[PDB]
Symmetry: none
Subunit: 123 residues, 4 copies
């Protein structure tokens, strides 16, 4: 299955946001990170990634197509807006092993607040 | 301003969901609840509602337009799916006075889990 | 099946638009006409409606839920923006009997231009 | 500014479609072609392309970012689905000089039908 996440200046969820901020996927799924507005990208939060998953960083304003082969939690940020809390979360498969890592990973205050909100969706 | 909330059997956020689950509005705004899938309605959570706001309960499968005049937090539920956690939150204006009431309001376990996730967006 | 049409001030398709501007449905389907921005409504174009279908006119800024029980073409307009060409088209079922009526119905110039574009999608 | 086009097996506009099928842009904009479904790509229609614009052909299932520097009409096709009418149109800037070329360019019957529908949006 394929999923889409938008990068936005302003949504219902606030300023500098990924929407949806949480994606539930299965191994082999595709996630498309697509700008709604200019100025954004997507980059892996290294401390919120499954084992063996390479970091990634898209170019500003480009759609980025991520295949989530490995199960677990994938945290993402927008590079210039990380401090403004622009973060998202993808859960791939059941019972993610890196839940604790995601709860404790160091990041800017607003990013941690939004990541904590996203973590509430883990199922 | 207008806002839109979809009533869904399933979304990225799970089963039986309002998407978006959080809306940020100002007095005079309208929020449209849209029957994207059949089987849903929208009903006020009486304990999460500003003073002077009349309760409401729409008919299954219909659109409902909520005009928010009074500032504060408005909690909403889908009647048949309340236990399945189908709840949403509208913040109207800055500095909502009823944050505590929203934190403590009694509801089914999954509803409380989802309301806690939504409350994290209050700004 | 349920379908959604947005009412917008400005889309890729221009100013004062329904998007999608064409919906392909089957008898018994539901179409939700939902504002993206304030100022819009949806109203039937009386001369583009199947036999026996009652006219409808939504209130400004409200989501409107239309059940398309009868087969044929349904033309819609936004009341205040009809002259600005804000029109849409729903095809319900195969081989619509009112195709000629839709091609010849009198309306403002910009509405006719956009209706002609929509009619190209009839299948 | 950014723009987004989805590559779809099916949409309201039919089978094998770009949605939106028409994009209005300005020089310097980017257009992201998003693999919402698998099986698609984006390729320039050589006869509908401004002067000095290099041809392009993306890989199946990938995102593609088109930077539009030169003004005029850019026609695009999906390679495997060209005969199925999977074509799109980008207008860059006012008063495009190559409208006639877009009207007459040779292509499969269904592609010409869909391109004629798209050309109706040129402004
Ligand atoms: Cu950003
Ligand atoms: Cu429900
Ligand atoms: Cu209008
Ligand atoms: Cu294709």
């Amino acid at each position: 299955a394929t999923h889409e996440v938008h990068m936005l200046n302003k949504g219902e969820s606030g300023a500098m946001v990924f929407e949806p901020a949480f994606v539930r996927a299965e191994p082999g799924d595709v996630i498309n990170f697509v700008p709604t507005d200019k100025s954004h990208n997507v980059e892996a939060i290294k401390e919120i990634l499954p084992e063996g998953v390479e970091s990634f960083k898209s170019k500003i304003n480009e759609s980025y197509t991520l295949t989530v082969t490995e199960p677990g939690l994938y945290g993402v940020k927008c590079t210039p807006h990380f401090g403004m809390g622009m973060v998202g979360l993808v859960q791939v498969g059941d019972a993610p092993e890196n839940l604790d890592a995601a709860k404790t990973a160091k990041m800017p205050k607003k990013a941690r607040e939004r990541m904590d909100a996203e973590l509430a969706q883990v199922n």
